[PDB]
Amino acid sequence: QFVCELKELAPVPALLIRTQTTMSELGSLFEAGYHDILQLLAGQGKSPSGPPFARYFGMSAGTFEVEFGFPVEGGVEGSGRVVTGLTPSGKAASSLYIGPYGEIEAVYDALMKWVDDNGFDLSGEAYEIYLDNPAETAPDQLRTRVSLMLHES
């Protein structure tokens, strides 16, 4: 029920916040951080050049790495907690998930199955691209591009 593909991601400029967090703080972290990035861009008379995303690394049960932000045209400067960087690069198993974010584990299970069957090894990092904003999109139509980063051995 999920179409999974091997994709070679090309990196582009991004404004990001790279930190470590726990599940209970994640919501507030994203709320304040994405706003930070947006206001920083606005202050410079600019805007994002792509949809927001987040990279996850570690166990959700403890403190895990989370790096998130927006792709940008570049030439923009970071400030405070916001830094300049790149969107992910390299190989990944990717699928487009549609529906409420809470039920996303379904696509992850499909992706992991795909990875095993295609002779790839997981890097451990997950990359999600939030194409639609849950504030103005009905659950059934909410798109999230999910990608599990891959190793090469």
Sorted by where each begins, the domain ranges of the chain are 1-153
Helix (H) or strand (E) holding 106: helix 105-117
CATH 3.30.1600.10 fits 1-153, yes or no: no
> At CA 62, angle to CA 61 and CA 67, rounded to 5?
105
d(CA 119, CA 93): 11
What does the block give as tokens for 60? Answer: 């959700």
Q: Taking the CA atoms of the chain, what radius of gyration do you get in angstroms?
A: 16
Experimental method: X-ray
- Burial group, residue 91, by CB count within 10 angstroms (0-12, 13-18, 19+): middle
Structural contact between residues 97 and 143, judged by C-beta atoms closer than 8 angstroms: yes
DSSP-H helix ranges across 8-145:
23-43, 105-117
Exposure b/e, 106-132, CB count within 10 A at least 16 = b: ebeebbeebbeeeebebbebbbbbbbe
Structural contact between residues 20 and 46, judged by C-beta atoms closer than 8 angstroms: no
Structural contact between residues 98 and 137, judged by C-beta atoms closer than 8 angstroms: no
DSSP 102: G
Structural contact between residues 150 and 93, judged by C-beta atoms closer than 8 angstroms: yes
Structural contact between residues 51 and 95, judged by C-beta atoms closer than 8 angstroms: no
**What region does 114 belong to: left with phi over 0, alpha with psi -120 to 50, or beta?**
alpha
Strands 13-21 and 64-71: antiparallel
d(CA 99, CA 47): 27
Q: Which residues contact 109 (CB under 8 A, 6 or more apart)?
A: none
